[PDB]
Amino acid sequence: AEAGITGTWYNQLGSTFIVTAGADGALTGTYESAVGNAESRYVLTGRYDSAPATDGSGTALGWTVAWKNNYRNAHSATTWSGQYVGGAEARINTQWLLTSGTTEANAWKSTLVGHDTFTKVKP
Amino acid sequence: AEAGITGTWYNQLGSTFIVTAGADGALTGTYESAVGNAESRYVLTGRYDSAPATDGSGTALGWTVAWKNNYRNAHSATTWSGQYVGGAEARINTQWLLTSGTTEANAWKSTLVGHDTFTKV
């Protein structure tokens, strides 16, 4: 359900994600690293399952950030894919891919993989 | 089909993989990069399914290469996980993980992911 996902969340390295879940399945907000402050803020867009299975199943969701804002351009995009498991301690558990723009010759080492856990702090 | 895995294989960027498959599931051999020089070679060891299914399914397999030999040590290791398909055009389809030894601070950016298709051509 949209309400539980909407809020401020944080991961183990100290990055901040702010997100609003719209009733048609849309996600929008901003992403920041632990330095905080305005510019490390980047736009994110994503989608989630607006009608989750009952059970104690999580809600599947995913989102993209392209690392360009008005102050910096890293020439790269990260996608996170994972599930929201709500309860007292609400959590979003993800795995992510970071791709960089490269020449044809260096394409074989363009993408990094990893995983992140977000703990919720506010709506 | 099973033992058709023993041979010489090439991926899409010119790297060469020579393997021996043992009857009980072991995979042993050498891997070398393009440029071809006699020590871009490194040792590999792996495992495969020695009694695969009888429907038209592929044979599951995997192997590791630590990137150290007598000349170079790139303080990293790659694993390939995938499956063998025989026929007149045999091939091995894989995806891989390359991890580098990092300090804790850089641990989040330690691993690269990719895909390779090996054939005997």
Binding site: A105, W108, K109 | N11, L13, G14, S15, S33, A34, V35, S40, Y42, V65, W67, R72, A74, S76, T78, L98
Partner: peptide
């Protein structure tokens, strides 16, 4: 970066 795995 650069590595021995390819080319």
């Amino acid at each position: 970066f650069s590595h021995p795995q390819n080319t």
